[PDB]
Amino acid sequence: AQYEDGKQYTTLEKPVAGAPQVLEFFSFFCPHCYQFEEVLHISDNVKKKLPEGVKMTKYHVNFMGGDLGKDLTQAWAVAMALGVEDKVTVPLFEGVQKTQTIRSASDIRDVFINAGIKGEEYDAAWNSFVVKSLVAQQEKAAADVQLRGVPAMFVNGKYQLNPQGMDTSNMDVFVQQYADTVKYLSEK
Ligand SMILES: c1cc(-c2ccc(CNC3CCCCC3)cc2)cs1
């Protein structure tokens, strides 16, 4: 077959009922994730190839970066709660991996302040139980598949993208194959 279980994707041994249609996991510490976001724009190109109004979900993980990694999962919860993902994703990646100016929870907060989120609003969200529940949701979703590597994408709780089996000579062709694979999986 043109798409084969074991090649462009794998099938979850223990499938996850009731999971988001398209679910991505990343870490701001993760070098491929940096590329997926700023260089390849994987999430954007998958959304364009899926039906309008499809639920795409993107969650941060704790297992890279120790204390700061957990702070970033909580900061990503704040980003989701306020709806400012599109404003902080690039500066968070660059602060962790490019300039390495993010060394503390305060430095993460600075990124939100610079992006125009008011300090009182960031702090209220950071301390909110709505954000605690978003953190729990991110952890539970990752736990549902004993996740140990990012970046990772899951389709309907059943299939995991396998980018290792895609040609990487041409960035655009790679992105297109990845997105076309997500579309194929979503239609299974
Ligand atoms: C979990 C996902 C990966 C992975 C494997 C391969 C790629 C593709 N690298 C891109 C391919 C296009 C050229 C630029 C770099 C991206 C991520 C390694 S572990």
Check pocket membership of 171 for ligand 1, CB cut-off 6 A.
yes
* Domains present along the chain, CATH in parentheses: 1-188 (3.40.30.10)
The answer to whether residues 111 and 102 touch, using CB atoms and an 8 Å cutoff, is: yes
Of 174, 175, 176, 181, the residue with max ligand 1 atoms within 8 A of its CB, to mutate for a pocket test, comes to 174
Contact partners, residue 91, CB within 8 Å, separation at least 6: 111, 114, 115
Q: Does 168 sit in the ligand 1 pocket, CB within 6 Å?
A: yes
- Would you say the CB of residue 174 lies under 6 angstroms from ligand 1? yes
Q: How many CB atoms lie within 10 A of CB 154?
A: 26
CB 116 within 8 A of CB 87: yes
Which method resolved this structure? X-ray
The DSSP line for 144-184 is: TTT--SSSEEEETTTEEE-GGGS--SSHHHHHHHHHHHHHH
User: Measuring CA to CA, which residue among 71, 69, 72, 112 is closest to residue 88?
Assistant: 112
Q: Which residues contact 110 (CB under 8 A, 6 or more apart)?
A: none
Instruction: Tell me if 177 CB under 6 Å of ligand 1.
Output: no
108 CB contacts (<8 Å, ≥6 apart)? Answer: 68, 71, 72, 75, 92, 95, 102
149 CB less than 6 Å from ligand 1? yes
Are residues 38 and 4 in contact, defined by beta-carbon separation less than 8 angstroms? no
For 26-79, give the DSSP string: E-TT-HHHHIIIIIS-HHHHHHHHSPTT--EEEEE-SSSSHHHHHHHHHHHHHH
What's the reported resolution, in angstroms, to a tenth? 1.8
φ, ψ dihedrals at 126, nearest 5°: -50, -40
